[PDB]
């Protein structure tokens, strides 16, 4: 019939709850994405997604009536298989990396544009396969390959810091980047440096950056507490 994207906002709605999400409604949506294999699929390789998003967001605004245009916009509204096992709803992850992006090396390819409005939904699949809590299996190029996004993403984090007053999803993209911050604490071994000369500069003096910028907007203080936490858990990490 189509993909709509007016359509594809439903896919969470039914089976996931405010707060609490069960493990058999779960189950059995993921299998089905899987076995139909012509569903709405994020795979736009390099040449297609590149041109497509950069001209959706800057040439119109306001949603793009509505952001249908059926190919850009479907992406955004697929967050169902990208929070489908966000938090711990994770029965089978490996069906998620295989099948679907692996969030450490399809994520990494159409990162050469870093969006936000991506990320958000993105990130948060990088958060369904990272890691549940715990149960993530122990994988290097899982924590060291995800090691590298914060400073690509750091700068453009930094630059779009800077501007006051001028944009309204900048505090949803920090409000919506600093779960993974929250979740666990940066890993200490071998790789992932431990905040050496290249990992600590970066991931402490621009921290309180966004910070500073956080405390300063007008918006309410509820958001405002986890930044300084966000900033202050990763210093002591």
């Known amino acids: 019939h189509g993909r709509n994207v007016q359509y594809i906002k439903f ?6 709850a405010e707060g609490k999400f069960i493990k058999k409604c779960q189950d059995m949506v993921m ?7 012509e569903d709405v699929l994020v795979f736009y390789n390099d040449r297609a ?4 998003l950069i001209q959706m967001m800057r ?11 059926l190919f850009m916009y479907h992406i955004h509204l697929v967050e169902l298989l990208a929070v489908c096992t966000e938090g711990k709803n994770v029965y089978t992850e490996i069906k998620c990396n295989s099948l679907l992006p692996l969030d450490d090396i399809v994520r990494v390819v159409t990162h050469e544009d870093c969006i936000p409005e991506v990320k958000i939904a993105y990130i948060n699949f990088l958060n369904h396969c990272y890691v549940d809590t715990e149960v993530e299996m122990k994988e290097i190029y899982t924590s060291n390959h995800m090691w590298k996004l914060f400073e690509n993403f750091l700068v453009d984090i930094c630059r779009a810091c800077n501007n ?7 505090d949803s993209v920090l409000e919506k980047y600093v779960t993974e911050i929250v979740m666990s604490i940066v890993t200490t071994f071998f790789s992932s440096p431990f905040s050496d000369q290249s990992t600590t500069l970066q991931t402490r003096q621009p921290v309180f ?3 500073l910028q956080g405390v300063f907007r007008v918006y309410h203080c509820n958001w405002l507490m986890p930044s300084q936490k966000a900033s202050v858990e990763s210093c002591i990490r």
């Open 209 to 211: 950056v966004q910070l």
């Open 49 to 52: 997604s590149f041109q497509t």
């Open 11 to 16: 896919l969470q709605t039914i089976v996931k």
């Open 164 to 170: 006051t007053s001028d944009r309204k999803h900048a």
């Open 31 to 37: 299998a089905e994405l899987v076995n139909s294999g």
């Open 59 to 69: 040439s119109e605004r306001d949603r793009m009536d509505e952001n249908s245009p």
